[PDB]
UniProtKB/Swiss-Prot annotation:
GO cellular component: small ribosomal subunit
Family annotation (Pfam families): Ribosomal_S7
GO annotation terms (biological process): translation
Protein name (Swiss-Prot/TrEMBL): Small ribosomal subunit protein uS7
HAMAP family: Ribosomal_uS7_A (MF_00480_A)
Family: Belongs to the universal ribosomal protein uS7 family.
Organism of origin: Pyrococcus horikoshii (strain ATCC 700860 / DSM 12428 / JCM 9974 / NBRC 100139 / OT-3)
GO function terms (MF aspect): rRNA binding; structural constituent of ribosome
Function: One of the primary rRNA binding proteins, it binds directly to 16S rRNA where it nucleates assembly of the head domain of the 30S subunit. Is located at the subunit interface close to the decoding center.
Keyword flag rRNA processing: no
């Protein structure tokens, strides 16, 4: 019922019609659980409790910085970082080719969450920000469609390559 024993999702809105049916905002596709899994597979040196704590602190930071429900900000970040199409490489002979392909709703989410965790993990490793602060910053940047966001910039890149590979 309560996310990480504190937040509610009943007032969180998914305005992107293409993702709304696949983002689970109901009590026990749980995006928070998915994010934790992505963070768990990144870094920031049980592994699950660790990732859980990093995400929870990141949410507290997001709420303080934006003044909004952290889960809602994550949804915006996901919606902004989820590419609407992708491509598959085919390096045959001496040249690699790009081909635009369908990307499923759940893979769109997985890509966005993976890139958010990757961006956070990268900033953390190289700056004086804790993993939680980097994750909060990455999520906020993505939610605001700010190119400084790794996930968002990656999303633009993927769609750019896909639209050109048609």
């Amino acid at each position: 019922i309560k996310v990480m024993g504190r937040w509610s999702t009943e007032d969180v809105e998914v305005k992107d019609p293409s993702l709304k049916p696949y983002i689970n905002l109901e009590p026990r596709v749980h995006i928070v659980e998915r994010l934790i899994n992505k963070v768990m597979r990144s870094g920031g040196s049980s592994k699950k409790v660790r990732a859980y704590e990093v995400v929870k602190e990141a949410f507290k930071i997001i709420e303080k910085r934006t003044g909004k429900n952290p889960i809602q900000v994550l949804v915006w970040a996901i919606e902004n970082a989820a590419p609407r199409e992708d491509t598959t490489s085919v390096m045959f002979g001496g040249i690699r080719y790009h081909v635009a392909v369908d990307i499923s709703p759940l893979r769109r989410l997985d890509v966005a969450l993976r890139n958010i965790a990757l961006g956070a993990s990268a900033k953390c490793y190289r700056t004086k920000m804790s993993f939680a602060e980097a994750l909060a910053e990455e999520i906020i940047l993505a939610a605001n469609k700010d190119p400084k966001s790794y996930a968002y910039s990656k999303k633009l890149e993927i769609e750019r390559i896909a639209e050109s590979s048609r």
